[model samples]
Target chain A: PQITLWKRPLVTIKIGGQLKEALLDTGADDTVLEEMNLPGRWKPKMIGGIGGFIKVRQYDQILIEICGHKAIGTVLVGPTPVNVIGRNLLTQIGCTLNF
Target chain B: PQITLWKRPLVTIKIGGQLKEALLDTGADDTVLEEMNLPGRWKPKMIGGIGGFIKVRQYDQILIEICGHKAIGTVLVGPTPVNVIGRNLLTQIGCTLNF
Candidate 1:
């Protein structure tokens, strides 16, 4: 599927039995989710983005259903304007930037 | 082109009479460059990201050569870890998110 930038490439996602819309962000190196309850021991981590650095809880090997495709990888739980599907998970689902 | 996330989706971009590498970041709403001199009247602006917000100078109607494709749009100049090509320019080049 090819998604034009006429609008933000927001897509449906499922995790922890919750359905939500997220952006397929190629610029972001890590996938970040707004505060969500995920059972598991997570490590404290910090990641840099356009603005600055933010502290987040890193959950490894979490399964996420993105655009109906299931992918398991590291998901950073933290405060964010929106849930982001970054390149880390994008690769698993074979998402790419095409022209 | 299908850009695999096995590595960062970095691409060559030409701007300000110089060539550099930048990431095609869908997660970013606005284009940001580390620091470059651009001639024009700009207003001070701030943008948010994964971490927080940063102040930048906004130059509108700037011509950028991305992946050999010329695009004219607004570009923000500020301190960033890396040069980023956001959706604003991606759309001009007919870039899309594909799977």
Candidate 2:
């Protein structure tokens, strides 16, 4: 019997009715969610970074299917220039990074 | 009309079983959520920032009461050194920074 699999790692999800591809990131401390794809009533608050605290808002959560697995989680609803997946999402699945 | 409101800017949220004070930051582009106070199953992914791409995961959303206003939204689950609110949460109520 023969099996097909990947040696590295692959995260799979459905976006716009299409199976998407993603690479695993380990340095990210939090889950990076795409704000545009989220839905629900989200509110804003102030966030302080190394520079200082800033005000921000949230809106929704998203359902993600990774590595042929699925989970529903919350996401900060808003806009970012990039699409990313973070630590918060990975820890729930008991998956860690290899680098 | 007798208006008894703050002229500057103030955002409120509940932290550690208490009402906490927050500020409004104009330069922030996204809502930053703290990871400690969320719920549910989550996972991780690699994220890239200026420091380089790193991995992170998310688990659940948190119900935050800001400025006496409350909303439930998704947050990147886990531990973050600081607590903050980002822009994504603020725009939902049709408000912007006065600064």
Candidate 3:
């Protein structure tokens, strides 16, 4: 029998100053983080979104390591549940989906 | 001389059919993707936001893999610059940020 797949399960990112984890989602086109589970030492300030000057609640870009690799960028804060790995951030590296 | 770091660059995600790239930002709190540059096969259907039934303008989830990992989710198509990795997705894996 043959197996079919939509997306693949990628590496996970561990956050500092906190006790939480995030899953990497490719179907997602951008990056995301949890609003309530951030580290205590890191206090991010809210900012505005590009869409119609929307105000974002989370700030403080953090470092992330995966497969012995690393990258940097900003995060969003809101009530929308389910964090996912977006395509914008993934395009930098020579990445591919595995089954 | 000593050096300090803001966040770490863990990994990069590549999109299908487009020639653009995005940066994985752990600082981000949510998952997002670019509206343009999506694969030719993808036909997104708009949805709504949680804050206030705000209608979305894109749809259709895709597969993305990074660092030998992958996951599935929705992608947001718009003009927001920079792709970031969020915490919600990172939580699924034992992720960490290296600086």
Candidate 4:
């Protein structure tokens, strides 16, 4: 798939039997999600931002299918407005920037 | 150039007369810069994130060179840890996600 950046690089994703829209965030090292729930063990962690670190629940080995490409990595449940698919999972799905 | 998600997608950028490394952020709607002194009229705005809306100065139609591709768009000045080139400039450079 070739995704042009004329708009926000949002893509459909399937996670834990649910479908949602997520952004491909090359600037972020880790994925962060909002809403939706999963029953699994998660550790409390912090992600640095402009003001301070964001408190989040870190769930490891979460499975996600992004734009039909399967990927698995750590997903953080946080208080964000949107779902972010970071480099941790982008690499797993073989995503790249071409020009 | 083909940039893989194996690492942080930082690229060389020439903006406001100097060189710096910037992240190609597909998830961000607007480009944000740090330690840059831009001239002309600027409007104060805020960009929302996890914590809160970060205060920024918006400069319209600024010139930039990302990975050698010249682009002009609105750039926000703020306390961001790293310079980020969002979809606005990415589109100008003909950037796309290929899998």
Interface root-mean-square deviation (Å) of every model: 1.3, 20.1, 12.8, 1.2
- TM-scores of the candidates are 0.96, 0.35, 0.36, 0.96
lDDT of each: 0.87, 0.41, 0.43, 0.87
The collision pairs in model 4 are none
> Which of 1 and 3 is ahead in lDDT?
1
- Candidate 4 global lDDT: 0.87
Off by over 4 Å in 4: none
Please compute DockQ, using alpha carbons, for every candidate against the native two-chain complex: 0.79, 0.02, 0.07, 0.79
Order the numbered candidates by DockQ, best leading: 4, 1, 3, 2
Model 1, range B13-97, lDDT digits (tens) per residue?
Answer: 9887888899888877789999888888999999877677889999999989998889999999998889999889999998988
Docking class of 2: incorrect
Model 1 ranges off by over 4 Å: none
Assess the local accuracy of residue B67 in candidate 2 as a C-alpha lDDT between 0 and 100: 59
Provide backbone clash counts, one per model: 1, 55, 63, 0
TM-score between model 4 and native = 0.96
The alpha-carbon root-mean-square deviation between model 1 and the true structure, to one decimal in Å, is 1.1
Model 2 lDDT per residue over A1-99, tens place: 111122212356664355655433222333343444444566774433232333444433566765655655644433333344444454544442111
